[PDB]
Amino acid sequence: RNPFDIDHKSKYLREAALEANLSHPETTPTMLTCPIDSGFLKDPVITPEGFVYNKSSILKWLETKKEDPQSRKPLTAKDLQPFPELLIIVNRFVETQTNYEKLKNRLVQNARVAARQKEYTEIPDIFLCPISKTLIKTPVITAQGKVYDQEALSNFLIATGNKDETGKKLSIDDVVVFDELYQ
Amino acid sequence: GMALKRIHKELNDLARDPPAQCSAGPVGDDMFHWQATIMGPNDSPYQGGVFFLTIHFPTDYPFKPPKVAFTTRIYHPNINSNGSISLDILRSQWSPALTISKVLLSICSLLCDPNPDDPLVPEIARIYKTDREKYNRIAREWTQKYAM
Prior knowledge:
The structure holds two protein chains of two kinds.
Chain A: H1 8-22, E1 44-46, E2 52-54, H2 55-62, E3 81-82, H3 87-115, E4 139-141, E5 147-149, H4 150-159, E6 163-164, E7 168-169, E8 176-177
Antiparallel strand pairs in A: 1-2, 1-3, 4-5, 4-8, 6-7
Chain B: H1 3-13, E1 22-23, E2 33-39, E3 50-56, E4 67-70, H2 100-112, H3 122-130, H4 132-146
Antiparallel strand pairs in B: 1-2, 2-3, 3-4
Helix pairs in contact in B: 3-4
C-alpha cells in the first residue's frame, strides 16, 4: 500500500486515545466531541481530509455549503465515511467520568459521617491535607480523587516544579475546586 | 440544542481558557444574547482602549453566524457609526467550526490590520489609504474619547 496515502482513522484513534488518557474527567476531550454540535461524537463520520463530525450535524451543514467546516475545501455527503470505531474511545471515557463521579460521592458521604462525630482527639483524615497535615481550608480535588488544600498544594507544586508525592507531574489546572466535600 | 447546547459549551470553555485580548459572557439570562469586551491591540491606534461588543446568537446557531456589533464608538474603515462590523466570517464565510472566541480574535486583528478595500465607511477608508498619520491620529483620539 502507498505510504503517501494516509489512513486518518488509525491516526485519529491513536491521538484520541492519548488525549482521553491525559484528560481530566470533568473535561470532555476535544476530539471526542463534534466540532459542530459540541457534544459527544455519537454517530461519527470521517472526511477524506481526516475531520470527524456527528453525521446529522455535518449533513445539516452540507445543506448550506458543500465544503468542510474546518478546511473550507469541497465536501459532499458521499465523502463521509462511517467511523464507528471511535465510539469505543468515547464509551471508554464516559466510563471514566462515571467512575470519577463515584469517587466524589464516596468522599462526600463519609465526610458527612466524620463530621457528626464529636470529641475526636485526631481530626479525621478526610478533613486533613496530605501535604499540609492541617485542616483543609479550601478543598481541591485531583483527577484520581485525592483532596488537597488549594494553596498548600499550589505552593508545593511551585516549590518542586509542578511535581508532587507520588513523584507525578501535577498542575493546579489539572485540579478542580471541591467545596462539596464539606457541604 | 443545538444552539443552546453549543452556547453553553462555548461559555464553559471561556471559564478555563479566556481569550488573552478578549473577555465574553452573557448579559443575563437570556443565553442567546451575550456581551463581550476586547482590548485595543498594541502598536495600533486602539492600544489601551477597552471596547464593548454585543452578541446575538441566531436560533439555528451554529449553522448561521452570530450577530456581532461594537457598542463602543470606534474609528475604523470596516466598522460604521452603528457598530456594524465588516468581516467575512460574520457573513458568507461563516463556518460552524468557528467559535465566538475565534470571532473575537478575528475582530481583534482587524483592528490591527484593517481592510480598506472592503469599506463600510468609505471616507475613513480613503484617509487610511492616502494619509495614515491622519488615520492613526484620529482613531487614537476617538479611543481616548469613547474607549474605557
